[PDB]
Amino acid sequence: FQGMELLKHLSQRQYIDGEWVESANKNTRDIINPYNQEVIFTVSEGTKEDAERAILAARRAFESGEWSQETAETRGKKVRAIADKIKEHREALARLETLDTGKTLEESYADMDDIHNVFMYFAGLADKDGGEMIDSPIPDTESKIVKEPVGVVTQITPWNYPLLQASWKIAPALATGCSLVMKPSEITPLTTIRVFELMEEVGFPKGTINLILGAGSEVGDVMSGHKEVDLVSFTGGIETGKHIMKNAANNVTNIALELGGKNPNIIFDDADFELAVDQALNGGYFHAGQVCSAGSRILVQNSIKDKFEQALIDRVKKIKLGNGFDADTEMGPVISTEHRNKIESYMDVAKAEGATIAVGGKRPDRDDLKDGLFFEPTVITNCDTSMRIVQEEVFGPVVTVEGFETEQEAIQLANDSIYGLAGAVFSKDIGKAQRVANKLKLGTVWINDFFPLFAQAPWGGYKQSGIGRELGKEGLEEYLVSKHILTNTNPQLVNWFSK
Amino acid sequence: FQGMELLKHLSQRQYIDGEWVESANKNTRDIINPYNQEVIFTVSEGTKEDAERAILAARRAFESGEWSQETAETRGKKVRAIADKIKEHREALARLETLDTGKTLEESYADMDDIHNVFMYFAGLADKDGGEMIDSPIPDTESKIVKEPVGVVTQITPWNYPLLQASWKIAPALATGCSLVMKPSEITPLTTIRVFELMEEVGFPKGTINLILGAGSEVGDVMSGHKEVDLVSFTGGIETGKHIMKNAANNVTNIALELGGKNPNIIFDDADFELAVDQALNGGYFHAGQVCSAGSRILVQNSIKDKFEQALIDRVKKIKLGNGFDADTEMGPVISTEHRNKIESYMDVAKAEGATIAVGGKRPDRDDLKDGLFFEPTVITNCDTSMRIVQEEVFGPVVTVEGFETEQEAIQLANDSIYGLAGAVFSKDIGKAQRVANKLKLGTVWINDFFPLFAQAPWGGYKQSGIGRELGKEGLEEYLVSKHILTNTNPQLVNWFSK
Amino acid sequence: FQGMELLKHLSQRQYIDGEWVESANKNTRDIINPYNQEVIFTVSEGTKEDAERAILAARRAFESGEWSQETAETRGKKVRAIADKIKEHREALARLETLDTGKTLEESYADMDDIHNVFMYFAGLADKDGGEMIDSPIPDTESKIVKEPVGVVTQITPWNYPLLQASWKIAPALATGCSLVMKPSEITPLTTIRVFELMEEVGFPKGTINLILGAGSEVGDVMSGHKEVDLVSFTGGIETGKHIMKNAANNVTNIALELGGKNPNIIFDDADFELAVDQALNGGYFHAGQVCSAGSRILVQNSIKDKFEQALIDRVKKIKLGNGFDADTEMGPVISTEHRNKIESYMDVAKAEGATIAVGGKRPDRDDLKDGLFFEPTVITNCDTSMRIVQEEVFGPVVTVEGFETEQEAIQLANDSIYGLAGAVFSKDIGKAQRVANKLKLGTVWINDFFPLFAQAPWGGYKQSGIGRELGKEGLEEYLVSKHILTNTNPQLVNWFSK
Amino acid sequence: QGMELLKHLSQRQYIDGEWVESANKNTRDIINPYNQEVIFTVSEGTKEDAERAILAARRAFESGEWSQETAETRGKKVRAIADKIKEHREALARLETLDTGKTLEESYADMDDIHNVFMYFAGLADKDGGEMIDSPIPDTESKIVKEPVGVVTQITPWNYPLLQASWKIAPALATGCSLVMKPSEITPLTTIRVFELMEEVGFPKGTINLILGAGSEVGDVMSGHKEVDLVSFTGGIETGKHIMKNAANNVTNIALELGGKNPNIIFDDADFELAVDQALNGGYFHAGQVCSAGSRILVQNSIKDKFEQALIDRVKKIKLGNGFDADTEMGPVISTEHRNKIESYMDVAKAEGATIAVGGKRPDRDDLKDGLFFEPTVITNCDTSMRIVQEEVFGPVVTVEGFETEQEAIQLANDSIYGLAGAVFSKDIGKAQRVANKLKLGTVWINDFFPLFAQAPWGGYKQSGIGRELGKEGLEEYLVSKHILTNTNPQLVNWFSK
Ligand SMILES: NC(=O)c1ccc[n+]([C@@H]2O[C@H](COP(=O)([O-])OP(=O)(O)OC[C@H]3O[C@@H](n4cnc5c(N)ncnc54)[C@H](O)[C@@H]3O)[C@@H](O)[C@H]2O)c1
């Protein structure tokens, strides 16, 4: 099959306490290629005991200090060498990801560029701020705040952008001096396995980094609830996130949650019309709409609603579907039969509550798409804010279209959801765009663009799209804890109690 | 009775959406003075629907923008007007707090001075950091982060220092423009009711501040679990904390937890001895040990242990118990019969597992204390880290004493608990105190001192003593949320999808 | 006037080392009211030995540490007391400023409000940052940066906005713990004398604050050149600033300079026309253009140029000149015969090089303005960037009008001067306003507004408009110096040199 | 000996992307201080070459190819220079030792530091664009954007040519400024090399420029030209005063890093052997030609005599020789003029009643006669009123003074026009900290001497300078703030009659 050579030397095992090792029970898992449903690889399926052992090794390593007591400058140099290795093997990593997740090759190349930059950013931030000096309000005292690594941290990622979500958590952890245990989505472990071999070549002490492979239903709880864990950085669906928070509570453990969204793409009548159409398509269908920042909820002003529906619909009929390795492919398949069915059930929900499937809504007929997990890019019209298809995250190549009369009605509709991750506003009137952006309860607002995000700036949600932040200085602040040391430079007896 | 004048004009009601109102079911509760167990006041015992009403009132107010959109400079002027009212009524407040909680009048004066200072600090911080500008990695884009108020916030406090703990939550909330709903310990609401009366006089838009009165076992779940709350700031026991975090997870709601501690007080043989004895007494018996920062776990170096034990014990026999208002009084009563019962049960625990009650460990015998909730300052010896009396937070006028041979052993013991709030180190060798300070997993560390904490510096725990911080800039950030606004100054079509 | 009452209790003396004292040689100076040219007051004219003595007192005090070593919190409380003194006495101060400088009362009330806010802003910034903790690249070392008060600072202000300019220097100086010696313009000392009376009431240690009254030509070289001066903060004309810098080099003394401006006011054809005219007038004739932030150089797009000129000209004819105390007055007189003379000489220079005096250009003939130092609001047309009238600062009620075709041309002209203090831009296309603002070499840029400046943000020049900043956090940093204290926690011999 | 390095080294200046000769074809011979022999010949630039350089910097800066490049990319480029320093570590270190005469091990320390300086600023490039202010005016957005200052001129001394050059180049490039640099006329070698290296990395035409020449011929143009936005100068105080004065003609910002009279304070409760070791190190590394040298030793009276005895006895054993020999502990001083300047101070010291306890002259040994060597010296029986104690000698010389108490030590240490760096030795850390706080110095070392790194700012209090180098503060010298205030609901004032 295609991509076969990339897998010839990849590890099938987990990585615990400095060694590549199997599952405690030698159980394994088959890895699927959503383009043809062929098994392409077989990796270990760790037990909860393996996860426990990894966590304990992380703690043991953290306490020894080899990495936590290493200078911030040096840690930065090592995070920077990881970055150099991403770029060195950019070609192989990009394919590996396309093969595992199904997105076009061009999309996977874009990630290796971001990933390189993500580690590169944190490598440079490592030695830039160790805390602060406070002007004490008590005479003859010195007051200071030192920032230390939180300790041991568990990192859990989703299947849509595996190595990308991994790097967002890995970079700051290592930059701060923490020891980490990571578990990628059970269905997309390929690139995460590669990066560990890469980090291993860079050289880290035994137990600083550990990789667990397995179902979240079996090892997850261990990772969110073990008492030696100080931080749990999770990226995934909301329900799994609530589970995690409640279990983390058993030992009052900090969390950082990066959940889903119902991201609005607000289009005013004075917008660059062809740009708005270009970006609606992009927002709704890159990686088959399996993107947490996908613009699945299009809000379009009534004056141009009709025209907008026609243009969008006509462009969607031309979207090329195929293998990610094919140069023509604009949109790939969805990740699994489970996920595909999930999306299919949403078409029945929509139809049954009053919405119109304007186009798509089914599997591709074609002779060259029948064997893959493809689903037609779709547009839903005649829907409103009370419908489940509009309120809930479908996480597929689906978008809804709602109209608004005014600027107030646009904000009202965009903020009318449990989520608050990201969104955009298209308009040539920047004063109006800036007004709107200020009233939107979103972690990230794009004015006349859709998708841009980078290490220099924090990413995360308002409301139920999350807790905490990733990337930028705040992304780093998650892996740090503050200690206030107050010295009394002229101690004196208080003499409150009798003598 | 002694403090009658203080209550002849005090309100007995809840404060919701600009009005002083009773409970939904006219239910009420009696508040007592722990020095004599006399009922001194009757207030409303509100319901969960009242709580829901407050939360909704705070939500409306926040969305109207009357406080949330007020300039940060003006918000700061009003927080400063509150600080001014604390100082203006300083006398009456300290007396009120002492009447309700039993602590000495001098301690209550100290609180009032800190409360003024807290509001003043945050009044002063309101307008200094609106967020940042990012040098964007994408040409022709403007990247910026704006810091916004988090929204509606619920604030829950303990009975030990009611107003002090309330100030730490109210000040930053207002400073940032959030709407708040507060509920103090059901047994100590007097000073909290008072400060609401004073914040009313300062002047705030309807629904911006709200006071709920009632048992947390009845109205607490609403304040932690309602979908409209954006943050729950909690200061109390660990189990209530875990219960709250699990509940807040139902709507992925931010939590800030300030829990208890098992604070070590380390005393080296090269420490100023009379200084150590003085601060060990203060650390152990201020407010009868009903203090989250109490130095309940004394670690003394073996070469001076016997000498230390007898001095400490000799001084404990001389501690003057009595009424808070009386100047000669050095230690007051404990808060309730339930809490004294809990402390009595710990003496039996200590004895059952092999420890020695070297002094105290019972009710005082004197005739004038017979009616109050007094319990003798106690010193427990011949104990170790495997015992419950050493591990668990007694929160009474009780300290345990353990020995250590070396520097490595003092630290090991100090970190051998699930907590990590605060601690102290006593030694004339400042290099050594600093080494030790750095390995101590505590939020705050005192070198040759015990207790100092002020608005200028963050406070909170490592491990299970908490999540997040109060005071300082970190404290302010719990009430703020970051939004990244990216503008494409030269938007261009991507043309990924076929035309 | 009703304002001669303001003066019956005002000090006529200098303030040195805690005492109100006369000149060393008892010399005096007569102060003038520009509306009628009458001598309203008489004060001490200090000698160069009085200045030397003031600086020596400020040094003595700084070293004793009564103020420099006081807590930052307490310093902030005092700066806050001064701010309250400004508000209490707002009325009297505003009248006094109008009496002394000729501007309207409405303008002086505005200054007093700003002034209050300046002291308040800095009171609150005082205790917010004492330095940083650095993560050292050398093992077994601690690295911290402490911010200290820079020491003794001399402060020199201009005659246009005496107290305002003084507030900008005093506030951070006292907040950071420095010692200051101030000298206001010799012709406008009234408000400055008053504010020293007020600062004395709040109470500061002897030496901390010092007031010298006198001609810069006599005592200025001592304030810039004495070796005990650590910083020299000057606000005045460019030629005096150059002289000062050169003098400060004798002892490598730090400098902060706020010089003049040739501030452009850019008006695109897509601007709100009536807003543009309103603002062009305001920027042009507030305080008879005797403003360092005055929009003297109007740049207007060609397509609306004729229409704009005519519109501006018609409005200028109606400007009402008179007494600053009369409510009908829109623009008062200029400061002195000398200053008026300078402006007049500028009308000749303009004419001889080919510009047109489209309106104004002379003293008003009117009967009630006859005895005053008035000068008609003027508009100069048919001018270009090579002309002196356009390149140089007139500092009068005069503006030059120049056309531009494109966006690049406006940017090129706006930036074609030796200056770079401030500027504005008017256009309904906010996108375009941002592009322009980015390319203007100016410390402050206004989009659709003119004159806004406040304590929360830094003010100062680019190019020859100055060195350093005033206001905001950067304003405070002028009064601080950094110290890297590096401690070696495990000192070891190097053994480079033989035994 | 180290002939091989120079074989392919450029002899010319670098202006507007071309390696070019002086306008008047003039040249200058470079010397190896160990043997006073001519090792290389370079161009002697004119002041018009300097004016041409500056005008090129201005053009490039305005064209925006570097000033408007993303901060992230600029950072990657600074990192590429960092890497070339490591790549050529060996050569550069031999080259610095050949030109300046210090030991090879010192030159290695420099290159490691130089790598880390570039690396640090490469990492700081994109971390802070400015800030959002909470405007007190309703319906207004307020933001402070940080922009590159403009054209910057950079001038360095002969003691640590490349080290001092790196402290200026790194932040300039990182922020997007354009530059024109001039090294000391006698030590231009490694600076010419670092330019050949920067050229291989790639920067647009005009961004970086190198002028070669005497400060008394081209220096005024670099401090006084009106197109210059900032003057970053590291050198002597007197030159410092001159430059500031000239820079004032166009109100041009300046950063000054000047000399010091750094105190090395030793209390009786210090680790005695640790204090003797570090006193030798602070006084004689690079033959005391270090801006951070501990030339003013202050020792508590109770151990003063003991310390003098020990120090002197150790100074007598200091190995003098060729910087290329592993045995050499101290090399020669830089030039004939600098050695005579030090000799004249010996006369001054003896004339004012001080004692030359040991050293104070050239060494006679046959193999050291052809080099610019001067014996490590120790001057006793002196006081704060004397010149030997108040002025920067910059030779291998120390002065020893006694102090009875903590206050007297503090008083003497601050009793100079300077305030750059200093040390405090004592096992009592509490005491070291009270002292550190009261010393008016840019950097204070507790129980150590010399540490300084990119992570923390370096500069002086009092007359040791204006501004800072290194750390975030050193970057801020190359940036200027712009307050952009937008009114989002403008309304007419209607002050003036319609
Ligand atoms: N906020 C963001 O930055 C962001 C980015 C990408 C994706 N997402 C979201 O992530 C989701 C991706 O889908 P997914 O199916 O991978 O998410 P998921 O919630 O199904 O699972 C994600 C990860 O959690 C693990 N897991 C499952 N149960 C667990 C448990 N009890 N304890 C611990 N771990 C457990 C899974 O094995 C997997 O590794 C989408 O909703 C998308 O919106 C968010």
Of B97, B107, B186, B258, the active-site residue reads B258
- The three-state secondary structure class of C42 is strand
- Which residues are CB-contacts of B322 (< 8 A; sequence separation ≥ 6)? B328, B329, B330, B332, B368, B369
A77, A124, A431: residue with CB nearest D75: A124
Beta-ladder partners of A16: A19
Q: Which pair of structure tokens corresponds to residue B495?
A: 């043309």
Is ligand 1 within 6 A of the CB of residue A419?
no
Yes or no: say if D85 and D197 are a contact pair by the CB < 8 Å rule. yes
Contact assignment for B71 to D430 by CB distance below 8 Å: no
Ligand 1 centroid to residue A216 C-alpha, Å: 9
Ligand 1 touching residue A151 (CB < 6 A): no
Contact between chains at D481 and C491 (C-beta distance less than 8 A): no
Please say whether the beta carbons of B17 and B57 come within 8 A. yes
Closest CA to D122 of A73, B311, A131: A73
Instruction: For A467-477, give one letter per residue: b (16+ CB within 10 A) or e.
Output: bbbbbbbbbbb
CA of A171 to the centre of ligand 1 (A): 19
- Report DSSP letters for A459-478, one per residue: B--SGGGEES-BSHHHHHHT
Q: Which of D122, D455, D472 shows the shortest C-beta gap to A124?
A: D122
Chosen for mutation from A135, A138, A252, A291 (greatest number of chain B CBs closer than 10 Å) is A252
Strand A19-21, strand A14-16: pairing: antiparallel
Which residues, in sequence order, are bridge partners of residue B153?
A: B180, B231
- Please list, in sequence order, all residues whose beta carbon lies within 8 angstroms of the beta carbon of residue D56, skipping any fewer than 6 positions away: D15, D16, D205, D206, D209
Q: How many CA atoms lie within 13 A of C203 on its CB side?
A: 1
Rounded to the nearest whole angstrom, what is the distance from the C-alpha of residue A363 to the centroid of ligand 1?
25
C126 Cβ neighbours under 8 A, 6+ residues apart = A135, B124, C72, C73, C75, C76, C79, C175, C176
Whole-angstrom CA distances from B274 to B303, B311, B399, B450, C183 are 16, 9, 18, 14, 54
Please list, residue by residue across A260-270, b when 16 or more beta carbons sit within 10 angstroms of its beta carbon and e when fewer do: bbbbbbbbbee
Query: Residue B186: phi, psi to the nearest 5?
Result: -60, -25
Residue D1 to residue D295: CA distance in whole angstroms: 33
Nearest CA to ligand 1 atom 11: A236
Task: From residue B440, give the alpha-carbon distance in Å to each of A345, B408, B416.
Answer: 54, 11, 10
For residues B240 and A14, what is the distance between their CA atoms, to the nearest angstrom? 38
CA distances from B163 to B94, B102, B176 (A): 10, 14, 20
Instruction: Answer yes or no: are the C-beta atoms of B164 and B108 closer than 8 Å.
Output: no
In which element (H, E) is residue A233 found? strand A231-235
Most C CBs within 10 A among B147, B456, B471, B476, hence the mutation to make, goes to B456
Are D132 and B131 in contact (CB < 8 Å)? Answer: yes
Helices D71-87 and D189-201: crossing angle in degrees, nearest 10, is 130
Q: What's phi and psi for D437, nearest 5 deg?
A: -65, -35
CA of D390 vs chain B CAs: smallest distance (Å)? 34
Phi (first) and psi of residue B416, to 5 degrees: -85, 70
Q: Are C124 and B124 in contact (CB under 8 A)?
A: yes
Burial of C320 from C-beta contacts in 10 A (0-12 / 13-18 / 19+): exposed
C121 close to C171: Cβ distance less than 8 angstroms: yes
The closest of B451, B407, B400, B435 to B270, measured between CA atoms, is B407
Buried b (16+ CB within 10 A) or exposed e, A37-76: eeebbebbbbbbebbbbbbbbbbebbeeeebbebbbbebb
Distances (CA, A) of B215 to B46, B102, B218: 8, 20, 6
Chain A nearest-CA residue for C70: A139
**CB contacts, 8 Å: B490 with chain A:** none
What is the whole-number distance in angstroms between the Cα of residue A273 and the centre of ligand 1? 35
Q: Which of A316-321's residues contact partners 24+ apart within 8 Å by CB, and which partners? A: A316/A281, A316/A285, A316/A359, A316/A360, A316/A377, A316/A378, A316/A379, A317/A359, A318/B497, A318/B498, A318/B499, A319/A281, A319/A285, A319/A377, A319/B497, A319/B498, A320/B498, A321/A364, A321/A366, A321/A369, A321/A374, A321/A376, A321/A377
Amino acid code (one letter) for B323: N
What span, in angstroms and rounded, lies between the C-alpha atoms of C134 and A129? 6
Candidates C64, C190, C169, C176; CA nearest to C123 is: C176
The answer for residues whose C-beta is within 8 angstroms of residue D121's C-beta and 6 or more apart is D78, D170, D171, D173, D174, D454, D475
Is residue B392 among the annotated active site residues?
Answer: no
> Which residues does chain B break after (C to N > 2.5 Å)?
none
Q: In degrees, to the nearest 5, what angle opens at C-alpha A450 toward C-alphas A449 and A451?
A: 130
- The residue assigned the tokens 């060694």 is A19
Residue with CA nearest ligand 1 atom 25: A216
Name the burial class of residue C343, with classes exposed (0-12), middle (13-18) and buried (19+) by CB atoms within 10 angstroms of its CB: buried
**How far is the C-alpha of A218 from the C-alpha of A46, rounded, in Å?**
9
DSSP-derived 3-state class of residue D410: helix
Of A29, A182, A235, the one to substitute when testing ligand 1's pocket (max ligand atoms within 8 A of C-beta) is: A235
Q: How far is CA D272 from CA B196, D317, D409, in A?
A: 63, 18, 17
Token readout for A82 is 């990881």
A–C: how many Cβ contacts below 8 A? 69
Judge whether C441 and C108 are in contact, CB under 8 Å. no
- Candidates A111, A240, A242, A459: which one to mutate for ligand 1, based on the most atoms within 8 Å of Cβ? A240
Residue D382 · residue D389 · CB < 8 Å: yes
Query: Which chains share 3+ C-beta pairs under 8 angstroms with D?
Result: A, B, C
Calculate the alpha carbon distances from A415 to A242, A268, A387, C393, D153 in Å: 21, 16, 15, 52, 53
Q: Relative to the CA of A244, which ligand 1 atom is closest?
A: 32
Which of D250, D473, D485 has the CB atom closest to C449's CB atom? D485
The kind and range of the H/E element at A53 are: helix A48-64
Please, are residues C137 and D116 in contact by the beta-carbon 8 Å criterion?
yes
Distance CA D153, CA C13 (A): 47
From chain A, pick out residues whose CB is under 8 angstroms from the CB of C134. Answer: 130
Show the tokens assigned to A204: 């880290």
Alpha-carbon separation of residue D142 from A448, C177, C431, C472, D133 (angstroms): 21, 29, 16, 12, 5
Q: Which of C45, C107, C258, C376 is catalytic?
A: C258
For residue D444, what is the enclosing H or E element? strand D443-446
Please state, in angstroms and as integers, the Cα–Cα distance from residue D401 to each residue in B7, D304, D385, following that order.
70, 8, 12
Report the separation in Å between the CA atom of A89 and the middle of ligand 1, taken as the mean of its atom positions.
Answer: 27
Of B128, B142, B456, the CB nearest to C125: B128
* Residue D64: closest CA among C411, B488, C391, C425: C411
Chain B residues inside the 8 Å CB shell of A64: none
Q: What is the CA radius of gyration of chain C?
A: 24
The answer to whether C282 and C330 are in contact (CB under 8 A) is no
CA distance D490 to chain C (A): 7
Between A71, A135, A144, which is nearest C135 by CB?
A71
Ligand 1 neighbourhood includes A162 CB (under 6 angstroms): no
Which residue out of B178, B186, B292, B383 is catalytically annotated? B292
From the CA atom positions of chain A, what is the Rg in Å? 24
Q: Is residue D103 a contact partner of residue D57, using CB atoms and an 8 Å limit? A: no
Strand locations in D183-248 (E):
230-234
A390: left (phi over 0), alpha (psi -120 to 50) or beta: alpha
Nearest alpha carbon, ligand 1 atom 33? A220
Distance from CA of A382 to the nearest CA of B (A): 25
Gap between the terminal Cα atoms of chain A: 88
Q: Is the dihedral of CA A287, A289, A291, A295 positive or negative?
A: positive
- By DSSP bridging, strand B131-134 and strand B141-149 are antiparallel
CA distance B430 to chain A (A): 9
Query: What is the C-alpha separation between C444 and C461, in angstroms, rounded?
Result: 8
What angle (nearest 5°) sits at the alpha carbon of residue B314, between those of residues B312 and B318?
Answer: 110
Q: Are B56 and B228 in contact (CB under 8 A)?
A: yes
Q: Which domains does chain C have, with CATH numbers?
A: 1-260+455-499 (3.40.605.10), 261-454 (3.40.309.10)
Question: Cα–Cα distance between D169 and D454 in angstroms, integer?
Answer: 13
Residue type, C201: E
As a 3-state breakdown, chain D gives helix, strand, coil percent values, each rounded to 5, of: 40, 20, 40
Method: X-ray
Query: Is there a contact between B130 and D133 if contact means CB atoms under 8 Å apart?
Result: yes
Q: Shortest CA distance to D283 belongs to which of D295, D297, D272?
A: D295
Return the half-sphere exposure (C-beta side, CA atoms, 13 A cut-off) of residue B62.
Answer: 27
For residue A216 and ligand 1, the question of a CB distance below 6 A is answered with: yes
Nearest CA in chain D to B75: D136
- What are the tokens at C447? 């989009």
Tell me the two tokens of residue C83.
Answer: 């701010």
> In this structure, how many other beta carbons lie within 10 angstroms of the beta carbon of residue A2?
16
Contact residues, chain C, for A132 at CB < 8 Å? 129-133
The protein residue with its alpha carbon nearest to ligand 1, atom 5, reads A292
Kindly tell me the burial class for residue A22, based on how many C-beta atoms sit within 10 Å of its own C-beta (0-12, 13-18, 19 or more): middle
Non-local (6+) Cβ contacts of C443 within 8 A are C420, C421, C422, C458, C459, C460, C461, C462, C465, C466, C469, D480, D481, D482, D483
Q: Considering only CA atoms, which residue is closest to atom 43 of ligand 1?
A: A260
Helices (H) then strands (E): counts for chain D: 16, 19
Task: Encode chain B in three state secondary structure.
Answer: CCCHHHHCCCCCCEEECCEEECCCCCCEEEEEECCCCEEEEEEECCCHHHHHHHHHHHHHHHHHCCCCCCCHHHHHHHHHHHHHHHHHCHHHHHHHHHHHHCCCHHHHHHHHHHHHHHHHHHHHHCCCCCEEEECCCCCCEEEEEEEEECCEEEEECCCCCHHHHHHHHHHHHHHHCCEEEEECCCCCCHHHHHHHHHHHHHCCCCCCEEECCCCHHHHHHHHHHCCCCCEEEEECCHHHHHHHHHHHHHHCCEEEEECCCCCEEEECCCCCHHHHHHHHHHHHHHHHHCCCCCCCEEEEEHHHHHHHHHHHHHHHHCCCECCCCCCCCCECCCCCHHHHHHHHHHHHHHHHCCCEEEECCCCCCCHHHCCCCCCCCEEEECCCCCCHHHHCCCCCCEEEEEEECCHHHHHHHHHCCCCCCEEEEECCCHHHHHHHHHHCCCCEEEECCCCCCCCCCCECCCHHHEECCECHHHHHHCCEEEEEEEEECCCCCCCCCCC
Distance CA B287, CA B296 (A): 13
CA distance D11 to B313: 83
> Is the Cβ pair B135, D143 closer than 8 Å?
no
Residue D370: partners with Cβ closer than 8 Å, 6 or more residues away: D35, D36
Distance CA A254, CA A229 (A): 9
Test A330 with B444 for CB contact under 8 angstroms. no
Q: Is A365 exposed, middle or buried (0-12, 13-18, 19+ CB in 10 A)?
A: exposed
The stretches of D2-46 forming alpha helices (DSSP H) are: 3-6
Nearest to C130 among A134, A146, A430 (CB): A134
- Between D104-124 and D161-175, two packed helices, what is the crossing angle to 10 degrees? 10
- CA-derived radius of gyration, chain D: 24
Residues in B lying within 8 Å of C, measured between beta carbons: 73, 76-77, 117, 121, 123-128, 142, 431, 434-435, 456, 473, 489
